[PDB]
Amino acid sequence: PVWKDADTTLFCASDAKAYETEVHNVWATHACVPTDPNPQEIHLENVTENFNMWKNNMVEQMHEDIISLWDQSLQPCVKLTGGSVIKQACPKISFDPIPIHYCTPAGYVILKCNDKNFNGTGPCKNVSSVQCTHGIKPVVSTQLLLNGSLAEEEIIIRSENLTNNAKTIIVHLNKSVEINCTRPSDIRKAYCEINGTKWNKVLKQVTEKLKEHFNNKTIIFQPPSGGDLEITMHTFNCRGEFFYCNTTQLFNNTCIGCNGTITLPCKIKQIINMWQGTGQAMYAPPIDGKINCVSNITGILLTRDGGANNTSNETFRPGGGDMRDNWRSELYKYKVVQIE
Numbered sequence: 127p128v129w130k131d132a133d134t135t136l137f138c139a140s141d142a143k144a145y146e147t148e149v150h151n152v153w154a155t156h157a158c159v160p161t162d163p164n165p166q167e168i169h170l171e172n173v174t175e176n177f178n179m180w181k182n183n184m185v186e187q188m189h190e191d192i193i194s195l196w197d198q199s200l201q202p203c204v205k206l207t208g209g210s211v212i213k214q215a216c217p218k219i220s221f222d223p224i225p226i227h228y229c230t231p232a233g234y235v236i237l238k239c240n241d242k243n244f245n246g247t248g249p250c251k252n253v254s255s256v257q258c259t260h261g262i263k264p265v266v267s268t269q270l271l272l273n274g275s276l277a278e279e280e281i282i283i284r285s286e287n288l289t290n291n292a293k294t295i296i297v298h299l300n301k302s303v304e305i306n307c308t309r310p311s312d313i314r315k316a317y318c319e320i321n322g323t324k325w326n327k328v329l330k331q332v333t334e335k336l337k338e339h340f341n342n343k344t345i346i347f348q349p350p351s352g353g354d355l356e357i358t359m360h361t362f363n364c365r366g367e368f369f370y371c372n373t374t375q376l377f378n379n380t381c382i383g384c385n386g387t388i389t390l391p392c393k394i395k396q397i398i399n400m401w402q403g404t405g406q407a408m409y410a411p412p413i414d415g416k417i418n419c420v421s422n423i424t425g426i427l428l429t430r431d432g433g434a435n436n437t438s439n440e441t442f443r444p445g446g447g448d449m450r451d452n453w454r455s456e457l458y459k460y461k462v463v464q465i466e
């Protein structure tokens with residue numbers, strides 16, 4: 127086998143149920159084929175292959191699909207786009223993301239990096255060959271990566287360029303921390319409950335590894351100062367409702383009487399600034415009854431402060447906004463090649 131680096135158009139696969147009215151299922155039913163009934167991963171003996179997750183067309187290809195999925199699935203009362211106005215009907219929908227596999231057409235194959243502490247760029251010593259990735263959930267998230275994969279060994283610090291502060295940092299956790307968000311039976315007041323013990327343990331480890339990457343320096347956490355509500359809050363979609371949660375308690379540099387349950391204040395918003403960058407959208411009020419989503423915190427989005435080269439500290443705040451990094455967090459060990 128001999129290959130070369132190449133971009134090409136991918137296709138998708140799913141376990142989607144054709145009887146479901148859930149929108150991820152309805153979209154995967156007509157845009158994707160069924161998942162590979164006999165998937166086989168094959169090792170590449172004595173092969174070293176270098177990867178670059180910040181340099182992967184797979185990401186932008188998935189991004190186009192999630193844009194597609196949201197525009198056909200989400201029914202907004204009125205669509206406020208670039209100097210435009212549209213008025214429609216906005217019934218409530220069934221919303222729950224399902225895993226999606228990304229697969230190469232003929233002449234192309236996917237290379238899988240299996241080195242347990244691969245950071246996302248550079249040489250991979252344990253390389254695989256697959257026809258499709260594994261099932262990736264398209265979770266649209268800010269500040270915190272939800273329902274993803276875990277790093278198998280240590281916590282991984284991923285970044286295209288650690289010395290550039292504009293570059294986003296992806297923290298790949300090795301132990302998931304549960305986030306339990308509930309709007310109980312304001313109709314827009316909600317809260318997310320987190321294990322403080324579990325949470326502070328893991329964030330202590332996150333700081334000890336950023337210490338390794340930044341020359342033993344003091345690692346400070348801080349809430350985002352300024353930006354849109356989707357940036358300064360942990361924003362996610364639970365069962366169709368847009369949750370905005372205040373995470374200041376999570377990035378508490380201190381509980382590093384504070385090892386119980388952390389309860390984050392949340393509000394469901396009807397008017398959101400779309401992650402697709404095209405403007406404002408207005409949706410309908412929340413459904414009646416108890417609205418609950420439990421998810422796994424599996425990764426953290428961070429931006430580092432600048433102007434601290436002559437200081438003794440480094441400051442990191444929760445990031446968000448560019449959903450590409452969310453897909454990048456799960457496609458990092460994949461790249462497409464052209465077989466020669």
Ligand SMILES: NCCNC(=O)N1CCC[C@H](C(=O)Nc2ccc(Cl)c(F)c2)C1
Pocket residue numbers: 266267268354356357361362363368369398399400401402403446447448
């Ligand atoms: N480093 C990139 C700067 N990002 C940026 O400029 N954006 C434009 C304005 C806010 C946009 C957004 O994140 N929207 C959103 C909507 C719903 C959910 Cl659930 C969610 F998690 C997020 C992103």
Ligand SMILES: *[C@@H]1O[C@H](CO)[C@@H](O)[C@H](O)[C@H]1NC(C)=O
Pocket residue numbers: 240241252
């Ligand atoms: C390579 O990765 C595989 C799959 O993750 C795993 O069995 C092990 O870590 C590695 N195996 C060899 C033979 O290097």
Ligand SMILES: *[C@@H]1O[C@H](CO)[C@@H](O)[C@H](O)[C@H]1NC(C)=O
Pocket residue numbers: 245246247248249283284285288339
């Ligand atoms: C990732 O590993 C490569 C070596 O392959 C190194 O050059 C790069 O600085 C590392 N990046 C991070 C963020 O650790």
Ligand SMILES: *[C@@H]1O[C@H](CO)[C@@H](O)[C@H](O)[C@H]1NC(C)=O
Pocket residue numbers: 273274301302421422
């Ligand atoms: C949450 O994480 C555990 C392991 O940490 C895993 O077994 C479980 O399936 C995860 N749940 C979801 C919804 O991903």
Ligand SMILES: *[C@@H]1O[C@H](CO)[C@@H](O)[C@H](O)[C@H]1NC(C)=O
Pocket residue numbers: 278279280281282300301331335
């Ligand atoms: C997670 O990684 C840290 C180092 O980053 C390590 O100390 C810890 O033991 C790991 N935890 C698990 C459950 O692997």
Ligand SMILES: *[C@@H]1O[C@H](CO)[C@@H](O)[C@H](O)[C@H]1NC(C)=O
Pocket residue numbers: 287288289290291
């Ligand atoms: C990373 O960013 C720093 C500061 O922005 C810059 O000086 C450096 O050349 C960049 N390195 C690479 C490899 O792009």
Ligand SMILES: *[C@@H]1O[C@H](CO)[C@@H](O)[C@H](O)[C@H]1NC(C)=O
Pocket residue numbers: 306307308319420
């Ligand atoms: C999530 O929280 C609600 C109320 O806060 C509680 O009733 C439920 O048992 C919790 N679920 C889990 C899995 O912790």
Ligand SMILES: *[C@@H]1O[C@H](CO)[C@@H](O)[C@H](O)[C@H]1NC(C)=O
Pocket residue numbers: 320321322323324386387
């Ligand atoms: C937090 O996790 C610990 C283990 O780290 C566990 O014993 C305990 O049940 C959890 N506490 C809460 C309040 O969820």
Ligand SMILES: *[C@@H]1O[C@H](CO)[C@@H](O)[C@H](O)[C@H]1NC(C)=O
Pocket residue numbers: 341342
């Ligand atoms: C960083 O601190 C650790 C503390 O365990 C020490 O072992 C290491 O030599 C230090 N390295 C640098 C570059 O300061």
Ligand SMILES: *[C@@H]1O[C@H](CO)[C@@H](O)[C@H](O)[C@H]1NC(C)=O
Pocket residue numbers: 358359372373374
């Ligand atoms: C989050 O809560 C703190 C107090 O707990 C408050 O000062 C801060 O303004 C809140 N964040 C936002 C974005 O409103």
Ligand SMILES: *[C@@H]1O[C@H](CO)[C@@H](O)[C@H](O)[C@H]1NC(C)=O
Pocket residue numbers: 222223265272273362363364365419420421422
């Ligand atoms: C994460 O997965 C669980 C189980 O599938 C689900 O209940 C929860 O709503 C998911 N979280 C998000 C943010 O989609």
